[model samples]
Target chain A: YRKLQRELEDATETADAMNREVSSLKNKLRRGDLPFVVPRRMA
Target chain B: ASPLEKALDVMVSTFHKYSGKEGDKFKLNKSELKELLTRELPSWLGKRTDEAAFQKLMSNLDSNRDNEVDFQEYCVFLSSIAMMSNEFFEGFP
Candidate 1:
């Protein structure tokens, strides 16, 4: 039980870092520094 | 198809698996988004989400201010995670 608990904590921390990265990217996108490309489907 | 292509397929299929469950059919409502994150990205999201945190997450993901996550928004979210994964792997051999 604790193993998975530890794993979850690790995952959550990694995810939190990603969240920060994501927020940074979004801020850039909002400021027009990063282009927001609309993803298209291949036929 | 290669592994990357297969992975793309899984992303698309997984989105549909949740998106087709409720209203809009092409979008994910809050509950659907929560379920998607909880089940598919359980490790990323942790075991549970408190309401305030989930609301903040929803607000962030709902880029269009439509109160729902459409396909484009979902793609952005996935791409961001992929970017993080790439950075992590680049540190290795």
Candidate 2:
């Protein structure tokens, strides 16, 4: 159970960081700073 | 979808599965919540809940002073448990 809890926390934190990165990437793309195309599903 | 996605689906479905049984289909009354915890979380919680402790838990979780627990409250309860459980590993380091 302890291990399960740690894994859950790690996963949740990782997901939050990844979501922030996705938002940053989207913002950069919208500004035309990076010529990258991201799929809606990926976002 | 990953295992985490599947687990989230289970959480949602499980909540609805019990929440729909009584008054206010969108929320869980005491008995409904109790049953869901006992059956679905037996491994994590372990054994039947003591009467006094169960009532205290319900009261604490009912943040809005409502007599029932909605999905948002349920999520908060689960998240707190996850956090507390995670804290158990602090002594290891």
Candidate 3:
């Protein structure tokens, strides 16, 4: 339930779902490819 | 995070695990909210249908909240925006 909240928060404005013009931006973020757009999620 | 983010977070995750396996649950959640507004709140919320009001409100809040509405503000604003639309339509009607 709590995690669901976080997912919803991120999904509402998630980079990949929101816009794809600069599509690489999201893939990069997921892969830790983009350093500054959003903080790198260290898995 | 901004106020809008907080609000959106709830909208997105209110029912399912948006961050993990339950991500797919969004479809119903999204639709249900839209349905609730369109079917349930129109009498007082606004004149326009759910889609129009919801989209406009979302965009406006996102822009105003600067990408986040926070939970409390989000809840209040969601109803308020719906009501505002109702008022606008009522005035026009």
Candidate 4:
């Protein structure tokens, strides 16, 4: 009987809503794009 | 502590939680992994037991015969969930 579905539920939904914001922010970033960026990560 | 550290913190600590019963000192047995998964990853059950079929799902911890999820064995899974949790929180690259 695995109920840890309860744990995954919240984390996943936050992902759901965050995805929504990101898609809209996609266009916003296009309008108001970058000022600076960070270094690439190491291997 | 960094979320990264805490993520790793609970990985060893959590493995310690379930690996201390019946069999090996630092290893996890079938019941232990089931309990481990049930407690730590309740949502991931049935939604996931095929992975337990992955025990062949705990049996699938892959190095069978011993049937116990050893420290390295459980460590692999511990690493998996913690990283998965980390990604869920950050969703980063």
Better of 2 and 3 by TM-score: 2
List clash counts for every candidate, in order. Answer: 0, 0, 15, 19
lDDT of 3 by residue, B6-54 (tens): 7666664552332122223322233444444445434434432335545
Model 4 residue B68 CA deviation (Å) reads 0.9
Instruction: Give per-residue CA lDDT, model 4, range A1-43, as digits (tens).
Output: 4434333333232332443455565556555554242232123
**Candidate 2 CAPRI-style tier:** incorrect
- Compared with the real two-chain complex, what DockQ does model 1 have? 0.09
lDDT of 2 by residue, A1-43 (tens): 1223233223233333443455577688777676556443252
Please report how far candidate 1 places residue A27 from its true position, in Å. Answer: 21
Task: Write the number of the candidate with greater DockQ, choosing between 1 and 2.
Answer: 1
DockQ score of the complex predicted as candidate 2 = 0.07
State which docking tier applies to candidate 3: incorrect
Candidate numbers, best lDDT first, in rank order: 1, 2, 4, 3
Q: What TM-score, over all chains together, does every model reach? A: 0.65, 0.63, 0.30, 0.52
lDDT tens digits, residue span B1-93, model 2: 899978877878999999999999999999998898778865454244356656766776676668998886777667666665678767566
The superposed Cα distance between candidate 2 and the true structure at residue B54, in angstroms, equals: 0.4
Tell me the deviation in Å of residue B51 in model 2. Answer: 0.8
Write the number of the candidate with greater DockQ, choosing between 2 and 4.
4
Off-target runs (Cα >4 Å) in candidate 1 are: A1-43, B91-93
After TM-score superposition, what is the CA distance of residue A30 in candidate 3 from its true location, in Å?
Answer: 0.8
Q: lDDT of all predictions, in order shown?
A: 0.69, 0.67, 0.42, 0.57
lDDT of 1 by residue, B6-86 (tens): 998998899999999999899999999989988888656634446666766677666667888887677767876666567
